[PDB]
Amino acid sequence: LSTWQTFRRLWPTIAPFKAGLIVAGVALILNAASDTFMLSLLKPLLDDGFGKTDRSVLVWMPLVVIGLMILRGITSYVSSYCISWVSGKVVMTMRRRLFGHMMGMPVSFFDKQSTGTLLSRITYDSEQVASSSSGALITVVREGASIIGLFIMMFYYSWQLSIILIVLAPIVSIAIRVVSKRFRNISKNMQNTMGQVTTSAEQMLKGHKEVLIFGGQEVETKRFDKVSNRMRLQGMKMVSASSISDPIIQLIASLALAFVLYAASFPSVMDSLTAGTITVVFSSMIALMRPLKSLTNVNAQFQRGMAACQTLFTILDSEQEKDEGKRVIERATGDVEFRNVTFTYPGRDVPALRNINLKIPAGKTVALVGRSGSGKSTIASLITRFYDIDEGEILMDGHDLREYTLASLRNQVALVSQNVHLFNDTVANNIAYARTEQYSREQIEEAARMAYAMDFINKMDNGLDTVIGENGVLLSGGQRQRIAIARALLRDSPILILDEATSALDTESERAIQAALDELQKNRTSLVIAHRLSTIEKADEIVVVEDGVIVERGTHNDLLEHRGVYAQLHKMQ
Amino acid sequence: LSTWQTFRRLWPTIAPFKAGLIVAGVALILNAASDTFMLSLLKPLLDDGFGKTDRSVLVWMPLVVIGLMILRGITSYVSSYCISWVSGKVVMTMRRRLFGHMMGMPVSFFDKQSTGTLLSRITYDSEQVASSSSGALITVVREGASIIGLFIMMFYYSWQLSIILIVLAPIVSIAIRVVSKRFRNISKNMQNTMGQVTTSAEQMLKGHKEVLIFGGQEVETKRFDKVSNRMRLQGMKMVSASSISDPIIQLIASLALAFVLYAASFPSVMDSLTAGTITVVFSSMIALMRPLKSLTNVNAQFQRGMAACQTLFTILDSEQEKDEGKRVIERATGDVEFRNVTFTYPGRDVPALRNINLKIPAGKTVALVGRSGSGKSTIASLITRFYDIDEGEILMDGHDLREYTLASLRNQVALVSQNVHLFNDTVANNIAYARTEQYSREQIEEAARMAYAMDFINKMDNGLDTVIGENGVLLSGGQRQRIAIARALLRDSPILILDEATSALDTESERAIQAALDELQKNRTSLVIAHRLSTIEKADEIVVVEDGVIVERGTHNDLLEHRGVYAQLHKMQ
């Protein structure tokens, strides 16, 4: 199939490191030739060694054995290390490409499955692919070289008994196969019948409810007696089938061996045959069995690994973010407006946003009121263009976002929330993340102090250079709120979205973040996903979206006079 | 431990068939002696055979091989068949005892575990126990006899190189173990560190939502670059560790072999050493490895099987139905009375029935109305005594049922419902089930005809002798209603419990079952779990039980005048 073409597809990666593969191949060939020579070592030990007197063969053969193990160990280590080096480099390159492509695919991808299996894809799948390919190569080369060496050793050493074996070993195998298959079929038949009787016993048990109420407990025992007798008979037949199977293979193999001996008995091949020369020949037919099985399984292993590589490449090539816009926006000082916006969340046939009309005035803040799942976060998601709207237009400065570059637009929006991501880095490199080459330490410290986020930083191990993260020094919810506020204030994002916390923190923590938000952070065009009524009451406009449709719009007092859904919810609050 | 005492507890079962075990043991010993002799066959083949000329050794040795393998096949078949016979008989006896005890446990037990796992207990567990014990015996005897034979062969054949081996081999095994363990420890350490770096990558993936909105996608790539480099280095170290463990083991074994050869080199043991006598000695140390591993695994396999036997015996001995009553009731012609009856269904903390009071007049029927889960079937269950009441008294003829024998009491109750159990037997042996020695065929046919259940019986293959069941000729719901009605009418049970169907069948089937029920069946003290308002309207008393309490008592018209819950349900119906 095309599984062997997967090697050609991977070749542009493995080929640059060909030396690390040539060394491994040479080492494996040397290993095979160090094992074949060991097998050939037997004949001098018997014919010219142990026989007659110890004519220095017995004092020199162990030295050869020791040297040959030294060679085998060295070559095995060299081959394994080189194979590991090339596999590690291939895995590293493939992981790099996969990740670089992976952090450019639309958020939707990461919603289809959780991040847990993505780490599996980028960690275990590449290791599996490289391990399977390396195993295929290290098996084919080594076992093929060993088989060739063993066959050469056979033919050189009294080929008369070798040419027989190669014409006799297969046919016996075929015969063996036949017998096994036949008897296997018999077993299958019995299994089917067994199932029936088993079901009968099961029915018996379900009769309990109806055997106690009548005068049972005796006829039931007799019927189970019959069923158990039948079960025992069937088990006996199965065991008899297996135990008449096995000795047939044994006898066929031993008959083959007897025929080999009888053929060697004739006075035509004995002349080139001695006591020691056989011990290398028959031992070859003993050591040859395993390489053949490895060669048979090498194709299955290769196919499995390289078919995993199929999905690993399928993830590698796909569609990415449609950054088909071309205009570049700096310092958005216009109006964010929703006009007949209809959107269906991926995975949800029922639309989540329907003809949503919403204007966010410049310099003013709006509070978006609604229940959980009402669609009051999908609006922000569309603002950041994590999902493209199905119908309508959303515009800032007067132009729809699908005609804007994704880098420029997203640089205009900064979100602060209770669930913010902290990269494993210094606190300063997290305040000015991705823009550390544009802002100085003084600006970072100014932002941190102005966002009321210095007291918890000046008390750290290294202050603003502490390595922070979730796999390191872990910060509290208020602390990460403050750090995100410092980041957003430093970046000076014209577009602001806010997800207010659903729970109140400590008095010191709440006092600070509240001061930051109100006095310092919120001075721009803000869209607040409000949860506290105090925040709602201090907003220039209130919008109450309801499961896809906004019901009422206005100020807090105006909506209270309206006596709508907002008034009822505020009464609840 | 006591796992070896499990054999003593099972001995009263296996011991009666000792001959089937003695034959198996003798056959296994003969198999071991046919393998040891086959190994000892090598020396004449090399020394006195293949060497010099073929002095009739080469034409007689294959005959010995053929005869020995014929003996091996015969003895293997005999041993396996005898072991299978004794195992099958033990399994049959244990299954019989288990089932006979199992049909005596109160319904409760059968509610704790579904009927699926009970069939597993009575089918697969006993086979597992017998298979494990038989494997333990067939391994210990055979492999121990083989080991003894091989050691005798070693000591007889040039003991000088045998006494060495049984000294060097063990110490080499210890040394090998040491090395492996040490390097294994190293691997473990790396794994821990590996985990950390893996989590880092996973963290980075979860940063997707926070990297697109800022000017990332570059520093992220650099961080993954560093992480991937560290991952590759750690994988390299792991492979290096494993690839430095294999060669050392190999080298240690080869050094042991070289020391053996050097020791044999000295002119003190060579005199008894010949070319052919050595192949038999070293081949023994090759064939001896597998029996040792089998002996090591014997105890583990035995413990596993005989610990499964522990739970199989735990089920065998337990509590049964409390048939502590001694008085016998015939033809119950009194009243069924519930007085302050409070009962908690097993597995439910909240009580199922609470101070339930109820009178079932002699010769009259009562319709007990309620919703699903209201406890409208637990009352019938208590009447049948599938469960014992926690407090209160339920009595027929004037005496509580815990003062009555369970056989006599349950002969006074016959339940007809839509879900009735049909045993795999003749239709007549189901009409007069468990009482086929008391009623003739004429009575069975009379009951079947009188219950309007003959038209569907006269049209079967053999009429009233058809083998019916759910694993055979399957009957319809109305047909099984009719067959249960015929059974109850034949038994002439004074007390009736009727569970009316929740759905209407065909017009012919409904007409027959309804006629049977009303005209013929219901002429006794009846407790009806009514579902249709028509059946309720022709009842002498209506009871509405819900949530362990009775809403109202009275007749249909009286309850309608009461304007209670029954009136509302009748309006609903």
Author numbering:
A (entry chain A), B (entry chain B): 7 to 579
From the paper:
The ATP-binding cassette (ABC) transporter, MsbA, plays a pivotal role in lipopolysaccharide (LPS) biogenesis by facilitating the transport of the LPS precursor lipooligosaccharide (LOS) from the cytoplasmic to the periplasmic leaflet of the inner membrane. MsbA forms a homodimer and exhibits a topology similar to other ABC transporters, comprising two NBDs and two transmembrane domains (TMDs) containing 12 transmembrane helices. Upon binding ATP, MsbA undergoes dimerization of the NBDs, inducing rearrangement in the TMDs. An ATP hydrolysis-driven conformational change promotes the transition to an outward-facing (OF) conformation, facilitating the flipping of LOS to the periplasmic side of the inner membrane for further modifications.
MsbA (78 µM) solubilized in C10E5 was prepared in the presence of 2.5-fold molar excess of KDL (194 µM) and incubated in the presence of 1 mM ATP and Mg2+. Four of the structures, ranging from 3.6 to 3.9 Å resolution, adopt open, inward-facing conformations (OIF) that vary in their degree of openness. a–d MsbA can adopt open, inward-facing conformations that are dynamic and vary in their degree of openness.
